[PDB]
Each structure stands twice: as structure tokens, then as C-alpha cells.
């Protein structure tokens, strides 16, 4: 069947692992996954196509990795994640994007901008701020909560839908 | 007379000590109180009741304490302080609240959200952002300046008024 | 001819050196100038006056300097620079201003507030936030991009125009 290789990136603590686990295992982890990389697989039907999603969950740049860029090199599409209550994580997105563009040696890589932790009220990144950033990249902006599940499927499926346009 | 045990918490440098000293001693300290805990008492009439306010001034989580949580355990109400020119301090509030909820073993603790340094123009937390957070907690939001005294009495007296509802 | 002594200050990474090089050498440096101080000169006609601009490019407070304040002491006007995608750099402005006021031993020093990196879409300091800060200081706010050249001449020439009022 059709395999889609997705990679999740973004600043430490934004909820990359929580999002991925919510998608795959349908529960919210309130704890912090100490791993720097992990891999997941989900067989799912997306718009009438039976798909195998291979998802590489990476750690934030704050942590040293084994083979980060080599692992990332294999990705077909990227979720670029920040948290809506963490302004620095939003500001950091541009460096994550630059890293992707370098590692894929292309300025035209399928991507979705994801504002996570939408269940929290201490919001410091307003939706319209994130919409501007996504517009500058020519990509969609989607908000998620790994806690409540809001947007989680939207985010990953939207990324499959971006890959299918490229 | 009636004693109210108040605790001031929040990120380093937000003005917890300055606020407390303004309330008690009616002056503004432009310097940084190096202490990690200190205690104050003020006999005051609040809405026609003669009250003794006992106020524990704590340091931000960035500094190690002796008995922080044990000391905090004794509090009847908490001022959760951030500074309007310090977005991270606002983002940190939720962890302070979580610490309180743990230490009091309750999700229903009297609290007031306080945005300090309202005399400064480098504002990065807008009033309506802080109002949202306070609304999510079911508590009032009040802005203060330890420098000009704006709001300082409002903040502490409002907290006494919250304790009286619980 | 008339010499104007300008000093560029602000947080690390905001683009102080990039701005100065764009003005003097008409190109954008995508790399990071490792120096902690450097000096530039440009002979230019500003509003019909032949001027020599002497510009001291300083490093952010995060880096230790030789003679920072002594060097700064010699300045007639200051560009106080933050980046529009770096909320902390904006919050830091007030300390830069305080340092200037100390070193010049005056509360009436010619200054311009500069929001750099206006070519970037990950904006977290809105124009109206920066306009408030500049208004509190009684100084102009100008946005720049060292990359595209937008505003760069405006910023420096505006500062010459402030010095001429003092
Ligand atoms: N309230 C709330 N908390 C979340 C959400 N997503 C993640 N978190 C929390 O934020 C913390 C960090 O989440 P985690 O998924 O480990 O983040 P990470 O981005 O993978 N970190 P690393 O870069 O170190 O791998 C966890 O405590 C987790 O429960 C969310 O949508 N809502
Ligand atoms: N302009 C202004 N400055 C304030 C205000 N409140 C506190 N400050 C200043 O901010 C600095 C830190 O204040 P302080 O009260 O020591 O903060 P703190 O929260 O107690 N820090 P700690 O967590 O280390 O105990 C002091 O220089 C003080 O003068 C305010 O309302 N306005
Ligand atoms: N996109 C964009 N990048 C900029 C702009 N100005 C500076 N930069 C970038 O930001 C990085 C840091 O710039 P630099 O001028 O060295 O900053 P600085 O303020 O002098 N740093 P220091 O305090 O260490 O001297 C450089 O990579 C540079 O290319 C700008 O207007 N737009
Ligand atoms: C996932 C998360 O952010 N938390 C569970 C908050 C607490 N964290 C991160 C944390 C880290 C490390 C240690 N420790 O080494 O002892 C902690 N002890 O309590 N919380 C800890
Ligand atoms: C209260 C406050 O934030 N200040 C007075 C600003 C200066 N601070 C914090 C500060 C700290 C430590 C030292 N020092 O150890 O030498 C300082 N020297 O000048 N300002 C200092
Ligand atoms: C100017 C700038 O911010 N950059 C070029 C981004 C990369 N930076 C800052 C950077 C710093 C130091 C080192 N290093 O010591 O090896 C780097 N190696 O790649 N980028 C580096
Ligand atoms: Mg993780
Ligand atoms: Mg980690
Ligand atoms: Mg915008
Ligand atoms: Mg599109
Ligand atoms: Mg204190
Ligand atoms: Mg302290
Ligand atoms: Mg809101
Ligand atoms: Mg109420
Ligand atoms: Mg520089
Ligand atoms: Mg430097
Ligand atoms: Mg904002
Ligand atoms: Mg305003
Ligand atoms: Mg003027």
C-alpha cells in the first residue's frame, strides 16, 4: 500500500511526542517521553486510500541526536510544531524550517505548521500571528491539543494531503 | 482577630517582593531582595473587619528554597504574579498554579492572577490575554505597579475577598 | 564637516551588525559577525548637510566587552534595536535605555527605537506594541530589514535628525 513518511519537529516541550502518541495510541501522555528519536506506524484509510503512515518523532534542537539530519532526510513531509503558550517555540519555527530546507536540499518541501496545546488558556501566540507565518511559507496552519485530541487527526492527515500535491 | 494567610508566588524578577513591601511599608524598592523567603504582617481593616494579614513572600522556582512547599502548604490564598513585560513569566503561571494545586491537594484554592509592572511601556502581555487565563481558572485578574502603587491594595484585598468565598 | 557619533545597541542576534553593514557597504550579511565592537565611517549628505557618520557597533549585554560604557559614553545618539521575531529582545530594550541614561548621566539622550528583521513573518512584536514603548520614551519607532534594506537609511538618518533637535 502507499507509505507516507512523516517527520515531527520543533522546540523542546511543545508536545511532538504527545501528538504522535495521541494519533497512534489514542491516549494523552501527561509525562515527558525522554527519547530523542522514536518511530511509529499506523495503517489508516485517508480519503479512500489505504495508507501506511511512518512517523519519525524527533527531539527539539536543544537535545543532541544520533543521525537527526540523516533520519530527517528520509521524510516526505514535516509537521513543524510550536506550542501556543510558548512564544520562543514559535519564534524558533523558522530555524526548523531552514534545517528542513537544507537537509532536503529544496525550498519546496511538504509541511504543515502546528500550534499545539490549544487546550491551555495562557496563550501568547494568537491564531492570526501563526496564520501569517504559515501564509509566508505557503502552507496550512492547524491548531491541536494532544490532551483533548482536537485537531490531531486534522494535522497529520492535512500533511498527507500536502505530500499528495507535491 | 481574623488572620488571613496569603502567599505570593511567580517567576523570578516579576516583583513579588516589591509588591509585598509596597503593601506593608508604603515604598518602592528599586533593588532586588536577595531573600528566598520572608514573612510580613499587617493589621488592617478590610470591608469593616479588623484583619491580620500574614504574607509569605517566596522566590521564583529558579531559586532553590528551604521548605518552599511546606511553607506554601500553610497558605489560605495565593497571588500568582507575572510581569506585563515578561511573556515567559506569564507562560510560567500555569506551573505555579499546578504547584499550588498539588501542595494544597485541591483544585479549588483561592487565587488572584496579578500582572505587575503596569507602569512599564514594554508590554508584551495584553490585558485581554491575561483576562482569558484568569477566566479559565475562575479567578480575577488584576494589574499592579509596585512602583506607583496602582492596584497593590486591590490585589491583596481582592485575594482576602476570594478566601472569604471559599 | 559635521560629525555625528552614533551607537547601535540591543540584545544579541537582533541584527545590529547586519544593519550597520547594510548602511555602510550596501549588502546583507547572512553570517554572524563575531566581533564585540567595531567602528565604521560614512561620508553622506543628509538634508543638504555633508556629514561624517561615525558608528560604533556594539555587541549585546550577553557578551563581555572591553570598555563598552566608555566607548558608549562618546555617543551622541543611540539606535536601540530589537528584532520583531524576538519578544525577549523587545522586553530587554528598557535595560539598554537605562544603561544609556546612566552612561550619559542624562534622561534626555537622542534615541530611535528600531524593530529589525521586518522581512520575517514570525512576528511576535506587533507594530503598535513598539509604538507604545517609543511613545513612552518620546522617540520615534522605525522598522528595518538589514536583508531587504527596508528602513535602514530611515533609521540612521532619523537618528541624525533627533540629535539635531537636542
Ligand atoms: N495541556 C497540554 N499539555 C501537552 C500537550 N501536548 C504535550 N503536552 C505536555 O507537554 C509536556 C512535553 O510534551 P512532550 O510530548 O514530551 O514534548 P516534546 O515536544 O516531545 N519534547 P522533546 O523535544 O524533549 O521530545 C508533557 O508534559 C505533555 O503532557 C497538549 O496539547 N496540552
Ligand atoms: N518598574 C517597575 N519595576 C518593578 C516593579 N516591581 C518590581 N520591580 C523591579 O523588578 C526587580 C525585581 O523585583 P523583586 O521584587 O526583587 O522581584 P521578585 O519577584 O521578588 N524576584 P525573586 O523571585 O528573585 O524573589 C526590582 O528591580 C524591582 O525594583 C514594578 O511594578 N514596576
Ligand atoms: N532575515 C533577517 N535576518 C537578519 C536581519 N538582520 C540580521 N539578521 C541575521 O541575524 C543573525 C544575527 O545578526 P547580527 O547582525 O550578527 O546580530 P548582532 O545584533 O550584531 N549580534 P551581536 O549582539 O552578537 O553582535 C545573522 O544571521 C543575520 O544574517 C534581518 O533584517 N532579516
Ligand atoms: C513532562 C514534564 O514536563 N513534567 C513531568 C514536568 C516535570 N519534569 C520535567 C521533571 C523533570 C525531571 C525531574 N527530575 O529529574 O527529578 C523531575 N522531577 O519532578 N518533575 C520532573
Ligand atoms: C534588582 C535588579 O534587577 N537590579 C538592581 C539590576 C542589577 N542586578 C540584578 C545585579 C545583580 C548582580 C550584580 N552583581 O553581582 O554585581 C550586579 N551589579 O550591578 N547590578 C547587578
Ligand atoms: C549567524 C547565525 O546565527 N548563524 C550562522 C547560525 C549558526 N550559528 C550561530 C552557528 C554558531 C556556531 C557554530 N559552531 O561553532 O560550529 C555553528 N556551526 O553552524 N552554525 C553555527
Ligand atoms: Mg518528544
Ligand atoms: Mg526530550
Ligand atoms: Mg500579522
Ligand atoms: Mg497550499
Ligand atoms: Mg523576591
Ligand atoms: Mg531572588
Ligand atoms: Mg484570547
Ligand atoms: Mg469568582
Ligand atoms: Mg554584532
Ligand atoms: Mg556576538
Ligand atoms: Mg503578543
Ligand atoms: Mg498598548
Ligand atoms: Mg520627538
Helices (H) and strands (E) in chain A, counts: 6, 6
Q: Does B135 touch chain C (CB under 8 A)?
A: no
A54-92: string of b/e by CB count within 10 Å (b at 16+)? bbbbbbbbeeeeeebeebbeebbbbbbbbbbbbbbbbbb
Question: What crossing angle do the helices spanning B152-163 and B16-25 adopt, rounded to 10°?
Answer: 90
Q: From residue A140, how far is each of A129, A136, A160 by CA, in Å?
A: 13, 10, 12
Segment (H or E) for B50: strand B49-58
- Torsion sign across C-alpha atoms A87, A92, A94, A97: negative
Rounded (5°) CA angle B113-B119-B122: 90
Residues C100 and B139: their CA atoms lie apart, in Å, by 40
| Ligand 6 pocket test target in C17, C21, C32 with most atoms within 8 Å of CB | C32
Residues B97 and B64: their CA atoms lie apart, in Å, by 18
A36 Cα: distance to centroid of ligand 7 (angstroms): 7
Ligand 1 pocket, A150 CB below 6 A? no
The structural domains of chain B, with segments of one domain joined by +, span 1-166
CA atoms within 13 A on the CB side of C73: 7
Point out the ligand 6 atom lying closest to the alpha carbon of residue C30.
Answer: 1
| Residues from chain A contacting residue B137 (CB–CB below 8 Å) | 121
Tell me the sheet residues that pair with A40.
A55
CB–CB of B57/B8 below 8 Å?
yes
Which three cell numbers, joined as nine digits, stand for B146? 509596585
Query: Experimental method for this entry?
Result: X-ray
Segment (H or E) for C115: strand C111-116
The strand pair at A141-143 and C141-143 is best described as unpaired
Segment (H or E) for A156: helix A152-163
The strand pair at A49-58 and A37-46 is best described as antiparallel
Contacts of residue A63, Cβ cutoff 8 Å, sequence gap at least 6: A12, A36
The strand pair at A77-83 and A37-46 is best described as unpaired
The strand pair at A77-83 and A2-10 is best described as parallel
Residues B22 and B44: their CA atoms lie apart, in Å, by 14
Residues A108 and A125: their CA atoms lie apart, in Å, by 26
Residues B38 and B21: their CA atoms lie apart, in Å, by 11
CB–CB of B87/A87 below 8 Å?
yes
E strands in C47-131: 49-58, 77-83, 111-116
Question: Residue C44 CA to chain centroid, in angstroms?
Answer: 18
Which three cell numbers, joined as nine digits, stand for C69? 560604557
Residues B58 and B60: their CA atoms lie apart, in Å, by 7
Kindly list the protein residues whose Cβ atom lies closer than 6 A to any atom of ligand 5: B 31-32
Rounded (5°) CA angle B102-B153-B21: 80
Residues C122 and B75: their CA atoms lie apart, in Å, by 41
Q: Does B91 touch chain A (CB under 8 A)?
A: yes
Nearest to C57 by CA among C149, C146, C147: C146
The pair phi, psi for residue A78, each rounded to 5°, is: -125, 135
The strand pair at A141-143 and A111-116 is best described as parallel
The pair phi, psi for residue B102, each rounded to 5°, is: -65, -55
Subunits close to A (at least 3 CB pairs below 8 A): B, C
CA-based nearest residue in chain A for residue C85:
A91
Resolution in A: 1.8
CA atoms within 13 A on the CB side of C26: 1
- Residue linked to cell 513569566: B89
Q: DSSP for A73-129, please give it.
A: HT-SEEEEEEETT-HHHHHTHHHHHHHHHHHTT-S---EEEEEE-TT-S---S-HHH
Instruction: Fill in the DSSP letter of residue B42.
Output: E
Segment (H or E) for B43: strand B37-46
CA atoms within 13 A on the CB side of A166: 18
3-state SS, residue B104 = coil
Topology of the domain covering C1-166: Rossmann fold (3.40.50)
Tell me the sheet residues that pair with C82.
C115
Residues in chain C: 166
Q: From residue C113, how far is each of B82, C8, C78, C93 by CA, in Å?
A: 25, 10, 9, 9
Residues B75 and B55: their CA atoms lie apart, in Å, by 9
CA atoms within 13 A on the CB side of B36: 10
Question: Residue B105 CA to chain centroid, in angstroms?
Answer: 19
Contacts of residue B25, Cβ cutoff 8 Å, sequence gap at least 6: none
Residues C36 and C38: their CA atoms lie apart, in Å, by 7
3-state SS, residue B129 = helix
Segment (H or E) for C2: strand C2-10
| Residues from chain A contacting residue B93 (CB–CB below 8 Å) | 122
Which three cell numbers, joined as nine digits, stand for A60? 527539539
CB–CB of A19/A146 below 8 Å?
yes
Between C129, C136, C137, which is nearest B124 by CB? C129
Residues B43 and B51: their CA atoms lie apart, in Å, by 6
Question: What crossing angle do the helices spanning B93-103 and B127-137 adopt, rounded to 10°?
Answer: 20
Amino acid at each position: 500500500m502507499t507509505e507516507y513518511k512523516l517527520v515531527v519537529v520543533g522546540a523542546g516541550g511543545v508536545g511532538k511526542s504527545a501528538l504522535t502518541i495521541q494519533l497512534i495510541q489514542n491516549h494523552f501522555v501527561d509525562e515527558c517521553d525522554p527519547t530523542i528519536e522514536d518511530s511509529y506506524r499506523k495503517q489508516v484509510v485517508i480519503d479512500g486510500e489505504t495508507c501506511l503512515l511512518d512517523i519519525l518523532d524527533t527531539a527539539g534542537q536543544e537535545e543532541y541526536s544520533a543521525m537527526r539530519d540523516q533520519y530527517m532526510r528520509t521524510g516526505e513531509g514535516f509537521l513543524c510544531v510550536f506550542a501556543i503558550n510558548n512564544t520562543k517555540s514559535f519564534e524558533d519555527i523558522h530555524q526548523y524550517r531552514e534545517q528542513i530546507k537544507r537537509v532536503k536540499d529544496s525550498d519546496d518541501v511538504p509541511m504543515v505548521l502546528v500550534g499545539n496545546k490549544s487546550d491551555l488558556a495562557a496563550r501568547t501566540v494568537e491564531s492570526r500571528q501563526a496564520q501569517d507565518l504559515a501564509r509566508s511559507y505557503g502552507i496550512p496552519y492547524i491548531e491541536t491539543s494532544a490532551k483533548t485530541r482536537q485537531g490531531v487527526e486534522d494535522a497529520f492527515y492535512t500533511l498527507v494531503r500536502e505530500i499528495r500535491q507535491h
